[model samples]
Target: DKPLRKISAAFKKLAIIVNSPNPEVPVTQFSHACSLVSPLFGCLGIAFKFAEMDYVAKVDDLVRASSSISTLVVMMDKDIEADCVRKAGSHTRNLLRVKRGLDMVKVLFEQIIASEGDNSLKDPATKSYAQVFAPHHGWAIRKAVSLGMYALPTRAHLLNMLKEDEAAAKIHMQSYVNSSAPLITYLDNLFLSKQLGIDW
Candidate 1:
């Protein structure tokens, strides 16, 4: 299947679903859409290995847990009641990690498109990594990203990866940014509402 095409289409649909007045993220749909994030990360090359590996596994965990847990709220509720909210591989923590990865893409696309004629992918990619992954990533991973930034794809190359031209990429990327903002906030508020905090 055409992966990038699916990612944009799927997330656009999910934006409407998750941002409904009721605002519930269905476990199956959320994980399924997120599982397609790999192509975007792959576009960033080896510099983003930490996020790619961690996010992929985290989404995998949620995908498996989807059968047992109905919605994201119930999944986090189960972990919170058991006091495993911060434990490794809990749905709560997994979703949080995945959310950061989601935001990284959002910010990267926004920066690139907003700049208009600038084709330097490195600046946007580095800025996105710093904004989203810096605080939590340790020195080793941080250093690795720094070295990896040198090899990030060009904007036009990235557009090719997504099977879109400049105009089309902007539309899909902006749509993703707009749709994901609400879902990201919703996830943050989920932890805040439970007093679990999001840093960890």
Candidate 2:
């Protein structure tokens, strides 16, 4: 399956799990979902190099921790108790980065659909990058992303890359946008409930 559809499916599962009577976000499942996102990142050229690689590496940390940390809550609480949730090496910190990466795509997917007539990925990519990632990035990194975004995959090209028609692409991208919201919010609320502060 394409990354968009698979991510939407994964998000549906995660949303269900998190909202269930006995809720959990298993580290393995989340890692698997994030792994599917690499293709979308790859199409974005320099954005993938400048922005995505580190987040995937961060996802790898979650993968590495899966044997020891079963769920998202468990990982966060472990880091919380250790008083290292904000530290550079903390799994919690890495999860935060990965979550932002998820949100970045979510927003990009949203903009593409919303601006229905747009042919290029440029507007959507630039805006979504500005909204979700630019503020968190340093000045130098911001400059790099600004220049790199010109090479972003066009909407039609992106659909071609996914091997889907534009109609089907819209459906999957919208599904991903819809389903990913709550999971990102769940992470936000987890931090808020712990008084850990949301923004890095």
Provide the lDDT at 55 for model 1. Answer: 88
**Residue pairs with backbone atoms closer than 3 Å in model 2 (clashes):** none
Question: Tens digits of per-residue lDDT for model 2 on 1-200?
Answer: 56667777888888887767777889999888887876777787886575555577888888899888889999998998888999996899998888888898899898989887778888888888899888888899889888887778878888888888878888988888777888888888888898888688
User: Which sections of candidate 1 miss by over 4 Å?
Assistant: none
Clashing pairs in 1: none
Over 4 Å off in model 2, which ranges? none
Highest-lDDT candidate = 1
lDDT (Cα, 0-100) at 14 in candidate 2: 84
RMSD of 1: 1.4
lDDT of 1 at 75: 92
lDDT (tens digit, per residue) of candidate 1 on 175-196: 7788788878888899898788
lDDT of 1 at 67: 91
lDDT of 1 at 89: 72
Model 1, global lDDT? 0.84
